[PDB]
Nucleic acid binder design. Sequence first.
DNA 1: CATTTAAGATATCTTAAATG
DNA 2: CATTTAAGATATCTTAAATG
Lengths: 66, 66
Amino acid sequence: TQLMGERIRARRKKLKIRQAALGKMVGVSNVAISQWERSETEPNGENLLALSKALQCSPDYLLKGD
Amino acid sequence: TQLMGERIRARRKKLKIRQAALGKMVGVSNVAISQWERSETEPNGENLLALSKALQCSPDYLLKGD
DNA sequence: CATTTAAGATATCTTAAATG
DNA sequence: CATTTAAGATATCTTAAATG
Ligand SMILES: [Tl+]
Ligand SMILES: [Tl+]
Ligand SMILES: [Tl+]
Ligand SMILES: [Tl+]
């Protein structure tokens, strides 16, 4: 089963931006992005919603996929 | 001005259910519900989404008011 | 260079006791 | 009774160092 982190990374790669660039858009460090993408952690409520807008997708898609 | 916890409590009061009943719907303790309502903590990503569904509103409404 | 690892501060949860 | 407070375990961040 596909993890949220893999969905985050795939979406970021489609947008052709670095982790630091996505972090700037969300309001977190590049390391936070790395942690989410590798499923070390999951974004908190505020960060998940900011991340979903930066990635142009729904929070539900990130959390649970299709 | 208005805090997310105030919006959570107002939405729960609209449903007329107890914190424990809401916690059961969301997947957390009554105590987590209390901590969110008192703005002591904020829900994580997964919990924010579950809460918004339980309360029949959007995650953005809870987070920022609309 | 871009990203991951590491250490550490603090937030987010838990169950039990206290409160009203 | 419902809710809050207390104590405590794990999760979520940060910056600095390590990696390739
Ligand atoms: Tl750590
Ligand atoms: Tl009492
Ligand atoms: Tl490293
Ligand atoms: Tl190197």
